[PDB]
A paper describes a structure:
Lipocalins are a superfamily of functionally diverse proteins with remarkably conserved tertiary structure despite significant sequence variation. These ~ 20 kDa proteins form an eight-stranded antiparallel β-barrel enclosing an internal ligand-binding pocket. The precise biological function of some lipocalin family proteins is not yet clear, even for those discovered more than two decades ago. This includes the first bacterial lipocalin protein identified, Escherichia coli lipocalin Blc. Blc is a membrane-associated protein anchored to the outer membrane by a covalently bound N-terminal cysteine lipid, and it faces the periplasmic space.
However, we were able to determine the structure of wtBlc-split protein at 1.94 Å resolution. The wtBlc-split asymmetric unit cell contained three ‘split’ molecules that differ primarily in the area of the two β-strands adjacent to the split point. Two fragments of the split protein together fully reconstitute the typical lipocalin fold. During structure refinement, we discovered a well-defined positive difference density map area in the binding pocket of one of the three ‘split’ molecules in the asymmetric unit. Based on the shape of the density as well as previous observations including color of the protein, absorbance, and fluorescence spectra, we suggested the presence of the heme B molecule in the structure. The heme molecule occupied the same hydrophobic cavity of the lipocalin as it was previously showed for vaccenic acid. In the binding pocket formed by chains E and F of the structure, there are 19 amino acid residues containing atoms within a 4.0 Å distance from the ligand (Glu45, Phe53, Glu54, Leu57, Val60, Asn76, Lys77, Gly78, Ser89, Phe108, Tyr113, Gly114, Gly115, Tyr116, Val130, Pro133, Tyr137, Trp139, and Leu141). Phe53 and Trp139 form π-stacking interactions with the porphyrin rings IV and II. The side-chain hydroxyl of Tyr137 and backbone amide of Gly113 stabilize one of the propionate groups of heme by hydrogen bonds. There are two additional amino acid residues from the adjacent ‘split’ molecule in the asymmetric unit (Ser148 and Glu150 from chain D) that contribute interactions with heme at the solvent front.
Author numbering:
A (entry chain B): 112 to 175
B (entry chain A): 23 to 109
The structure:
Amino acid sequence: FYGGYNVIALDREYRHALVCGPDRDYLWILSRTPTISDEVKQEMLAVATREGFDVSKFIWVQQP
Amino acid sequence: TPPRGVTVVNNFDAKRYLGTWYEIARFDHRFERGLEKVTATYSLRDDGGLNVINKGYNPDRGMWQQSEGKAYFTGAPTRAALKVSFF
């Protein structure tokens, strides 16, 4: 098991990241905190849609 | 290669990326399907790659599991494009 890992967007303070794999069927939202804001949520979704990712494929992962 | 057309961070500072990140959302694949409370932890190797540990809670096994990997940059370490091999 091996493959590409690409940080496609990252804020100035290294707190929020959009990471894709070797093609548009692989995408992740990463955060330094277990929950994020409605505002951060929409910016990440806007960027993914802009770069041709289908945001309908997202699963929202259970976090404490 | 990165997918055709996508942006890749081009002033990447790997040292500032190190430590723990929470997975907020994913496109679902069989390797992660069903795992909750997923974290990724990154540390710097002597040979200039990254060590990766992916942890999640598997409510079927009722257990914490992790997988470990080795990541290398495919070019400049200021270009956030890597290949990860799991073992």
